[PDB]
Amino acid sequence: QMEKVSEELILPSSPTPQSLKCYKISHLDQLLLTCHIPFILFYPNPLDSNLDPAQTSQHLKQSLSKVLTHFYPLAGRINVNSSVDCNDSGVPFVEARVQAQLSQAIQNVVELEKLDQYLPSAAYPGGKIEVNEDVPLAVKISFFECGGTAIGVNLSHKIADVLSLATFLNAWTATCRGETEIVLPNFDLAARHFPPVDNTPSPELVPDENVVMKRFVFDKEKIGALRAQASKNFSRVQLVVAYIWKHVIDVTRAKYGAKNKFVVVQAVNLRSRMNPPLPHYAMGNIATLLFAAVDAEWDKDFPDLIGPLRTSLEKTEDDHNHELLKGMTCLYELEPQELLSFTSWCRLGFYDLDFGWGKPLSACTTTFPKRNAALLMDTRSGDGVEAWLPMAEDEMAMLPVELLSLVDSDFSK
């Protein structure tokens, strides 16, 4: 049970010069949704400090304001498909009080959809409030009775991938700590290497109906089991993707008939795959789609899908435009149940984000309302992998026990 305290718009601490040049929209951005990337950190009550909500909010707001001088496009408004007006309209900053302790509130989140309340605005369609598609950035801080807090961020996907979210949060937290050495964003590179195309529509998101998301947790010991069953050098992600893919194939072939192929698609950072690479601090959607597939009759063991996936990660001799056309070519003559997808928030330093009073207890997100559109995240120990997997309720139910046992709803530990 929470109550809103206030909403304000945070401006950059010095106005954006009419001179300065706002973020130019790239081709890759044009192809993305106008939905937001919803991101949530829960912090315990600090052991060093004894700061008032008011004081904690002041540090946060002043430091946001300072850092928006470098991330000024984030205070503008998006002009969909083409550009961003750097008009310093400001970032919505929401403050709430929740009548409960942190641990009590997040130790048994049965419906992950209820994490919505920690977001400052809608990320996706289908709630009571419409998405504000023009707003690049909004934030919310919720204060618990214990001293614990939650910071929710909605960053527009038309203007950022999760690497760009991380560039932003590293800068914001670091500014809040009062450091002089921030890693500065680069806003120019994206449209240089991927120039936009005129009249390109942004795709609309139509939510699917019977979808729930659960967080399936694979800890060090579980990965070890997978690693060991697979015996070659197997990384954490390959093992987990393979394992889930095997089990969603079984559900798909049992509910629906087996038809054409089964595909899995991973969205990974394109910066490090360029020849030569782009820096991690280039802002914008700079990501690519890597495909793996097995035909309809497949039915083998989960280590058998790893080949397909490893082969999938190979950087190719083919240019971006071709990679994209292949991608779209396969995606469109696929029936909706034949696609499984994974985006990764892996290895982005989210559990190191320290505003000045400690590192997170948990990082979460909200329900992307489409079947089989999953999300891989780090675990607080750097061991293990969290899979945030949305599915049709009836389909999730058909998963085997060895998988469904991994569902974890305690975010307090």
Short mmCIF file of C-alpha atoms in Angstrom, two decimals:
data_model
loop_
_atom_site.label_atom_id
_atom_site.label_comp_id
_atom_site.label_asym_id
_atom_site.label_seq_id
_atom_site.Cartn_x
_atom_site.Cartn_y
_atom_site.Cartn_z
CA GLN A 1 0.00 0.00 0.00
CA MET A 2 1.68 3.22 -1.24
CA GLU A 3 0.81 6.93 -1.46
CA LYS A 4 2.26 9.44 -3.92
CA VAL A 5 4.10 12.30 -2.20
CA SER A 6 4.99 14.44 -5.23
CA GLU A 7 5.88 14.64 -8.89
CA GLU A 8 8.36 17.15 -10.26
CA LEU A 9 10.29 17.56 -13.53
CA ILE A 10 14.10 17.49 -13.16
CA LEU A 11 15.92 19.83 -15.49
CA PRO A 12 19.66 19.81 -16.38
CA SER A 13 21.42 22.11 -13.93
CA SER A 14 22.38 24.51 -16.73
CA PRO A 15 19.98 24.91 -19.71
CA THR A 16 20.81 23.16 -22.95
CA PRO A 17 22.43 25.65 -25.32
CA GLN A 18 20.27 26.17 -28.42
CA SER A 19 23.62 25.32 -30.04
CA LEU A 20 24.28 21.88 -28.62
CA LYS A 21 22.69 19.31 -31.03
CA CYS A 22 20.28 16.73 -29.70
CA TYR A 23 20.48 12.96 -30.17
CA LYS A 24 19.95 11.99 -33.79
CA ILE A 25 17.70 8.95 -34.32
CA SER A 26 19.40 6.00 -36.08
CA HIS A 27 17.94 3.33 -38.32
CA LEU A 28 18.20 0.81 -35.47
CA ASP A 29 16.21 3.15 -33.15
CA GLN A 30 13.52 3.53 -35.83
CA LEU A 31 13.01 -0.22 -35.83
CA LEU A 32 12.47 -0.33 -32.06
CA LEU A 33 9.31 0.02 -29.99
CA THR A 34 8.29 3.22 -28.22
CA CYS A 35 7.70 1.15 -25.03
CA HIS A 36 10.03 1.77 -22.07
CA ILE A 37 12.72 -0.45 -20.52
CA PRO A 38 11.44 -0.81 -16.97
CA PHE A 39 14.20 -1.17 -14.35
CA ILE A 40 13.97 -1.46 -10.53
CA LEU A 41 16.54 -1.42 -7.72
CA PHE A 42 15.72 -2.22 -4.13
CA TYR A 43 18.12 -0.96 -1.49
CA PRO A 44 18.07 -2.02 2.14
CA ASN A 45 18.19 0.45 4.98
CA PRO A 46 21.88 1.65 5.04
CA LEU A 47 24.21 0.80 7.91
CA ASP A 48 26.32 4.03 7.85
CA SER A 49 23.77 6.77 7.22
CA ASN A 50 20.57 7.96 8.91
CA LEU A 51 19.23 10.26 6.19
CA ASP A 52 15.62 11.59 6.04
CA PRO A 53 13.57 10.69 2.95
CA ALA A 54 13.72 14.45 2.16
CA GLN A 55 17.55 14.42 2.36
CA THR A 56 17.82 11.18 0.36
CA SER A 57 15.53 12.67 -2.34
CA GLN A 58 17.54 15.93 -2.42
CA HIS A 59 20.82 14.06 -3.08
CA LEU A 60 19.06 12.14 -5.86
CA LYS A 61 17.33 15.11 -7.50
CA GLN A 62 20.32 17.46 -7.36
CA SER A 63 22.60 14.74 -8.76
CA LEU A 64 20.12 13.85 -11.53
CA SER A 65 20.00 17.55 -12.43
CA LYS A 66 23.77 17.80 -12.56
CA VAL A 67 24.14 14.67 -14.71
CA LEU A 68 21.43 15.70 -17.17
CA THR A 69 23.85 18.37 -18.28
CA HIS A 70 25.74 15.56 -19.93
CA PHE A 71 22.70 13.44 -20.76
CA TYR A 72 20.56 16.45 -21.87
CA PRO A 73 18.71 14.56 -24.60
CA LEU A 74 17.13 12.60 -21.79
CA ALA A 75 15.29 15.76 -20.71
CA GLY A 76 13.93 16.44 -24.16
CA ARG A 77 10.91 14.94 -25.83
CA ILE A 78 10.86 12.35 -28.60
CA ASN A 79 9.38 13.20 -31.94
CA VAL A 80 8.57 9.72 -33.10
CA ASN A 81 10.41 8.15 -35.91
CA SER A 82 12.66 11.08 -36.64
CA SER A 83 14.33 12.97 -33.76
CA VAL A 84 14.39 14.29 -30.21
CA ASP A 85 13.67 17.90 -29.26
CA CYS A 86 16.22 18.96 -26.70
CA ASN A 87 13.69 21.39 -25.24
CA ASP A 88 14.55 20.73 -21.56
CA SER A 89 10.97 19.65 -20.72
CA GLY A 90 12.50 17.65 -17.85
CA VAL A 91 12.40 14.17 -16.39
CA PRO A 92 9.35 13.15 -14.33
CA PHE A 93 10.52 12.40 -10.78
CA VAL A 94 7.97 10.60 -8.60
CA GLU A 95 8.12 10.22 -4.86
CA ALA A 96 6.11 7.72 -2.88
CA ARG A 97 5.79 6.42 0.72
CA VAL A 98 4.89 2.75 1.29
CA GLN A 99 3.20 1.61 4.49
CA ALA A 100 5.42 -1.47 4.99
CA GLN A 101 9.03 -2.62 5.49
CA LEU A 102 11.16 -3.53 2.44
CA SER A 103 11.70 -7.16 3.41
CA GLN A 104 7.98 -7.68 4.08
CA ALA A 105 7.00 -6.08 0.79
CA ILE A 106 9.34 -8.07 -1.50
CA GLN A 107 9.90 -11.52 0.09
CA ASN A 108 6.95 -13.13 -1.66
CA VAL A 109 6.03 -11.34 -4.87
CA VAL A 110 3.48 -13.81 -6.23
CA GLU A 111 2.48 -11.69 -9.24
CA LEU A 112 5.51 -9.98 -10.66
CA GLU A 113 3.11 -7.51 -12.28
CA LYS A 114 2.63 -5.82 -8.91
CA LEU A 115 6.20 -4.45 -9.27
CA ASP A 116 4.53 -1.86 -11.56
CA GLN A 117 3.87 0.29 -8.51
CA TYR A 118 7.65 1.12 -8.20
CA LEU A 119 7.71 2.45 -11.80
CA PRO A 120 6.98 6.19 -12.28
CA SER A 121 4.77 5.60 -15.31
CA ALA A 122 3.59 2.92 -17.71
CA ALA A 123 6.31 0.96 -19.53
CA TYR A 124 3.91 -1.14 -21.61
CA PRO A 125 0.33 -0.90 -22.89
CA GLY A 126 -2.53 -2.65 -21.12
CA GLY A 127 -2.51 -0.92 -17.72
CA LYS A 128 -4.75 1.93 -16.59
CA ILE A 129 -2.34 4.71 -17.68
CA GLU A 130 -1.17 4.94 -21.31
CA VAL A 131 2.55 4.84 -22.14
CA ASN A 132 3.94 8.36 -22.66
CA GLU A 133 5.81 7.53 -25.85
CA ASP A 134 7.58 10.90 -26.08
CA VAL A 135 9.29 10.81 -22.66
CA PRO A 136 12.83 9.47 -22.85
CA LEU A 137 13.34 9.14 -19.10
CA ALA A 138 11.29 9.03 -15.88
CA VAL A 139 12.19 7.96 -12.37
CA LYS A 140 10.52 7.15 -9.06
CA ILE A 141 11.76 6.70 -5.53
CA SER A 142 9.63 4.82 -2.95
CA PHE A 143 10.46 4.95 0.79
CA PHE A 144 9.84 2.06 3.15
CA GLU A 145 9.20 2.18 6.87
CA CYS A 146 12.54 0.47 7.60
CA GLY A 147 14.65 3.08 5.75
CA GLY A 148 14.83 0.85 2.68
CA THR A 149 14.04 2.25 -0.78
CA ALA A 150 13.12 1.38 -4.36
CA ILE A 151 14.32 3.30 -7.42
CA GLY A 152 12.24 2.63 -10.59
CA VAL A 153 13.45 3.87 -14.00
CA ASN A 154 11.59 3.93 -17.34
CA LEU A 155 14.03 4.68 -20.20
CA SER A 156 12.56 4.80 -23.69
CA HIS A 157 13.46 1.99 -26.03
CA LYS A 158 13.25 4.32 -29.01
CA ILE A 159 16.30 6.01 -27.63
CA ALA A 160 18.28 3.44 -25.60
CA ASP A 161 19.21 -0.23 -25.22
CA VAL A 162 20.14 -1.65 -21.80
CA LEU A 163 23.83 -0.84 -22.34
CA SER A 164 22.67 2.79 -22.67
CA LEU A 165 20.66 2.41 -19.45
CA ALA A 166 23.87 1.30 -17.76
CA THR A 167 25.89 4.17 -19.16
CA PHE A 168 23.28 6.45 -17.65
CA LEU A 169 23.07 4.77 -14.24
CA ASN A 170 26.85 4.47 -13.83
CA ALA A 171 27.00 8.24 -14.46
CA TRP A 172 24.06 9.14 -12.21
CA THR A 173 25.25 7.04 -9.24
CA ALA A 174 28.79 8.25 -9.63
CA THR A 175 27.71 11.88 -9.68
CA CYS A 176 25.60 11.22 -6.58
CA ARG A 177 28.80 9.90 -4.87
CA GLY A 178 30.40 13.24 -5.79
CA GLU A 179 33.13 11.78 -8.04
CA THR A 180 34.74 14.12 -10.61
CA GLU A 181 35.45 11.36 -13.18
CA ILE A 182 32.19 10.33 -14.90
CA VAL A 183 32.22 8.18 -18.07
CA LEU A 184 30.67 10.56 -20.58
CA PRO A 185 27.95 9.49 -23.06
CA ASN A 186 28.57 9.77 -26.79
CA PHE A 187 25.41 10.74 -28.64
CA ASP A 188 26.73 11.06 -32.17
CA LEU A 189 28.14 7.66 -33.10
CA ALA A 190 24.79 5.83 -33.47
CA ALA A 191 23.34 7.74 -36.46
CA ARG A 192 26.75 7.94 -38.08
CA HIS A 193 27.18 4.17 -38.36
CA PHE A 194 23.48 3.46 -38.83
CA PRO A 195 22.02 6.48 -40.67
CA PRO A 196 18.20 6.85 -40.46
CA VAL A 197 15.74 6.19 -43.31
CA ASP A 198 12.85 8.62 -44.03
CA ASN A 199 9.20 7.69 -43.27
CA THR A 200 10.14 4.53 -41.34
CA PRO A 201 7.26 3.55 -39.02
CA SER A 202 7.92 2.44 -35.50
CA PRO A 203 6.42 -0.95 -34.81
CA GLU A 204 3.37 -1.04 -32.48
CA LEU A 205 3.15 -3.48 -29.55
CA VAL A 206 -0.07 -5.47 -29.26
CA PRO A 207 -0.04 -7.18 -25.82
CA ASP A 208 -0.90 -10.88 -25.65
CA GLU A 209 -3.70 -11.83 -23.30
CA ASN A 210 -2.89 -14.80 -21.02
CA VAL A 211 0.74 -13.98 -20.27
CA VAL A 212 2.45 -14.17 -16.93
CA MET A 213 6.10 -13.72 -16.17
CA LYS A 214 8.10 -15.68 -13.58
CA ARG A 215 11.70 -15.31 -12.47
CA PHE A 216 13.50 -18.65 -12.77
CA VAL A 217 16.72 -18.65 -10.77
CA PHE A 218 19.79 -20.73 -11.62
CA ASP A 219 22.43 -20.58 -8.87
CA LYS A 220 26.08 -21.71 -8.93
CA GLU A 221 25.13 -25.26 -7.90
CA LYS A 222 22.43 -25.55 -10.70
CA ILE A 223 24.76 -24.23 -13.40
CA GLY A 224 27.34 -26.72 -12.17
CA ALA A 225 24.72 -29.46 -12.76
CA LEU A 226 24.03 -28.21 -16.26
CA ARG A 227 27.74 -27.72 -17.00
CA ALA A 228 28.37 -31.26 -15.78
CA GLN A 229 25.46 -32.81 -17.65
CA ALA A 230 26.94 -31.26 -20.80
CA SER A 231 30.13 -33.41 -20.61
CA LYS A 232 34.20 -28.16 -24.82
CA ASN A 233 33.98 -24.90 -22.86
CA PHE A 234 30.43 -23.95 -21.75
CA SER A 235 29.52 -20.46 -20.50
CA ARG A 236 26.68 -19.80 -18.01
CA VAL A 237 24.30 -18.22 -20.59
CA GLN A 238 24.70 -20.97 -23.27
CA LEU A 239 23.82 -23.65 -20.68
CA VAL A 240 20.78 -21.79 -19.40
CA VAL A 241 19.45 -20.83 -22.83
CA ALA A 242 19.89 -24.39 -24.09
CA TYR A 243 18.12 -25.82 -21.05
CA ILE A 244 15.13 -23.52 -21.36
CA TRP A 245 14.95 -23.92 -25.13
CA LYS A 246 14.76 -27.75 -24.81
CA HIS A 247 11.84 -27.44 -22.39
CA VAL A 248 9.86 -24.83 -24.36
CA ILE A 249 10.22 -27.01 -27.48
CA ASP A 250 8.54 -29.90 -25.56
CA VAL A 251 5.60 -27.65 -24.47
CA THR A 252 5.24 -26.17 -27.97
CA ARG A 253 5.20 -29.57 -29.68
CA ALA A 254 2.71 -30.94 -27.11
CA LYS A 255 0.19 -28.05 -27.08
CA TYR A 256 0.45 -27.13 -30.79
CA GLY A 257 1.43 -29.64 -33.43
CA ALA A 258 5.08 -29.57 -34.50
CA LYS A 259 5.10 -27.49 -37.72
CA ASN A 260 8.08 -25.83 -39.47
CA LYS A 261 11.15 -25.15 -37.31
CA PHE A 262 11.79 -24.00 -33.74
CA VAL A 263 13.82 -20.76 -33.44
CA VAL A 264 15.61 -19.03 -30.58
CA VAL A 265 16.80 -15.50 -30.94
CA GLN A 266 19.24 -13.67 -28.73
CA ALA A 267 19.61 -9.88 -28.71
CA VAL A 268 23.16 -8.91 -27.88
CA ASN A 269 25.29 -5.78 -27.87
CA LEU A 270 26.39 -4.91 -31.40
CA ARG A 271 29.16 -2.44 -30.30
CA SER A 272 31.77 -5.13 -29.53
CA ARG A 273 30.92 -7.03 -32.72
CA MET A 274 31.63 -4.13 -35.05
CA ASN A 275 34.78 -4.09 -37.13
CA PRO A 276 36.35 -2.08 -35.39
CA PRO A 277 34.24 -1.96 -32.21
CA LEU A 278 32.22 1.07 -31.02
CA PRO A 279 32.72 2.21 -27.43
CA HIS A 280 30.40 0.92 -24.70
CA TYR A 281 29.43 4.51 -23.94
CA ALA A 282 27.84 5.12 -27.36
CA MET A 283 24.19 5.83 -26.57
CA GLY A 284 21.24 4.44 -28.54
CA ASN A 285 19.97 1.07 -29.73
CA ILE A 286 23.15 -0.62 -30.86
CA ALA A 287 22.17 -4.23 -30.75
CA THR A 288 21.81 -7.23 -33.04
CA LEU A 289 19.73 -10.42 -33.35
CA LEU A 290 21.48 -13.84 -33.39
CA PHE A 291 19.44 -16.83 -34.56
CA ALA A 292 19.54 -20.52 -33.79
CA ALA A 293 17.12 -23.14 -35.08
CA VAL A 294 16.17 -26.78 -35.04
CA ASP A 295 13.58 -28.35 -37.38
CA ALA A 296 10.15 -29.67 -36.19
CA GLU A 297 11.17 -33.31 -35.59
CA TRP A 298 14.06 -32.44 -33.22
CA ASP A 299 13.48 -34.03 -29.72
CA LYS A 300 17.00 -34.72 -28.28
CA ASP A 301 18.84 -33.69 -25.04
CA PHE A 302 19.46 -30.07 -23.97
CA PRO A 303 23.28 -30.22 -24.68
CA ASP A 304 22.39 -30.93 -28.29
CA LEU A 305 21.02 -27.36 -28.75
CA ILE A 306 24.30 -25.76 -27.70
CA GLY A 307 26.02 -26.29 -31.06
CA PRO A 308 23.28 -24.31 -32.83
CA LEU A 309 23.68 -21.53 -30.25
CA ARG A 310 27.50 -21.37 -30.32
CA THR A 311 27.47 -21.30 -34.15
CA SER A 312 24.88 -18.52 -33.76
CA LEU A 313 27.32 -16.26 -31.91
CA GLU A 314 29.86 -16.27 -34.74
CA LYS A 315 30.56 -12.77 -36.02
CA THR A 316 29.95 -12.91 -39.76
CA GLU A 317 31.37 -11.60 -43.03
CA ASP A 318 27.89 -10.16 -43.88
CA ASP A 319 27.00 -6.43 -43.43
CA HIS A 320 24.37 -5.04 -40.90
CA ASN A 321 21.60 -4.50 -43.48
CA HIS A 322 21.94 -8.14 -44.63
CA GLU A 323 21.95 -9.49 -41.05
CA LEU A 324 18.77 -7.43 -40.48
CA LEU A 325 17.01 -8.75 -43.62
CA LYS A 326 17.83 -12.36 -42.74
CA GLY A 327 16.42 -11.58 -39.27
CA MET A 328 13.16 -10.07 -40.53
CA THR A 329 12.92 -12.73 -43.31
CA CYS A 330 12.72 -15.57 -40.76
CA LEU A 331 10.64 -13.75 -38.11
CA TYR A 332 7.71 -13.02 -40.45
CA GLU A 333 6.86 -16.42 -41.84
CA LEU A 334 7.06 -17.83 -38.34
CA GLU A 335 3.91 -18.87 -36.49
CA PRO A 336 3.79 -17.12 -33.12
CA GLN A 337 4.58 -20.19 -30.99
CA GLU A 338 7.76 -21.06 -32.94
CA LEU A 339 9.84 -18.17 -31.62
CA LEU A 340 11.71 -18.01 -28.27
CA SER A 341 13.72 -14.88 -27.47
CA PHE A 342 16.24 -13.65 -24.91
CA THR A 343 17.58 -10.23 -24.18
CA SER A 344 20.38 -10.05 -21.64
CA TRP A 345 21.17 -7.63 -18.87
CA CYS A 346 24.15 -9.84 -18.14
CA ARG A 347 27.46 -8.35 -16.94
CA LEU A 348 26.41 -4.68 -16.88
CA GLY A 349 27.45 -3.90 -13.23
CA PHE A 350 23.86 -3.38 -11.98
CA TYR A 351 24.62 -4.91 -8.57
CA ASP A 352 27.44 -2.39 -8.07
CA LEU A 353 25.18 0.66 -8.49
CA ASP A 354 25.84 2.70 -5.40
CA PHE A 355 24.27 6.08 -4.91
CA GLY A 356 26.23 6.71 -1.70
CA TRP A 357 24.52 4.38 0.77
CA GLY A 358 25.22 0.89 -0.52
CA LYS A 359 24.72 -1.61 -3.29
CA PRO A 360 21.33 -3.10 -4.35
CA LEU A 361 19.60 -6.03 -2.70
CA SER A 362 17.67 -6.71 -5.95
CA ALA A 363 17.27 -5.64 -9.58
CA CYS A 364 13.98 -6.43 -11.32
CA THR A 365 11.75 -5.56 -14.21
CA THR A 366 8.11 -5.67 -15.19
CA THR A 367 6.14 -7.98 -17.48
CA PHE A 368 6.86 -7.53 -21.16
CA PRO A 369 3.37 -8.62 -22.39
CA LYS A 370 4.36 -11.10 -25.17
CA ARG A 371 4.75 -14.89 -25.12
CA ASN A 372 8.29 -16.24 -24.97
CA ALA A 373 10.05 -12.87 -24.83
CA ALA A 374 12.55 -13.49 -22.04
CA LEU A 375 15.29 -11.58 -20.25
CA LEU A 376 18.49 -12.93 -18.71
CA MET A 377 19.91 -11.17 -15.63
CA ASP A 378 22.84 -11.50 -13.26
CA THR A 379 22.36 -12.79 -9.74
CA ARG A 380 23.56 -10.77 -6.72
CA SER A 381 26.54 -13.16 -6.24
CA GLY A 382 27.74 -12.89 -9.86
CA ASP A 383 27.22 -16.62 -9.75
CA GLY A 384 24.14 -17.94 -11.52
CA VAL A 385 21.59 -16.50 -13.94
CA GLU A 386 18.00 -15.24 -13.52
CA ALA A 387 15.62 -15.92 -16.45
CA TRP A 388 12.58 -13.59 -16.53
CA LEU A 389 10.34 -15.64 -18.71
CA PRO A 390 6.88 -14.46 -19.89
CA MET A 391 4.54 -17.17 -21.23
CA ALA A 392 0.91 -18.07 -21.78
CA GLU A 393 -0.34 -19.16 -18.34
CA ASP A 394 -1.40 -22.55 -19.71
CA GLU A 395 2.02 -23.00 -21.36
CA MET A 396 4.03 -22.11 -18.31
CA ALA A 397 1.97 -24.71 -16.44
CA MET A 398 3.15 -27.39 -18.88
CA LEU A 399 6.84 -26.87 -18.10
CA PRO A 400 8.39 -29.79 -16.20
CA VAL A 401 8.99 -29.70 -12.38
CA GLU A 402 12.83 -29.51 -12.60
CA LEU A 403 12.25 -26.13 -14.32
CA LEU A 404 9.18 -24.84 -12.40
CA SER A 405 11.02 -25.45 -9.06
CA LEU A 406 13.37 -22.65 -10.09
CA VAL A 407 10.62 -20.05 -9.87
CA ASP A 408 11.67 -17.69 -7.09
CA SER A 409 9.45 -14.89 -5.71
CA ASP A 410 11.59 -13.85 -2.72
CA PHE A 411 13.43 -10.65 -3.66
CA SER A 412 14.33 -9.85 -0.05
CA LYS A 413 17.19 -12.32 0.46
#
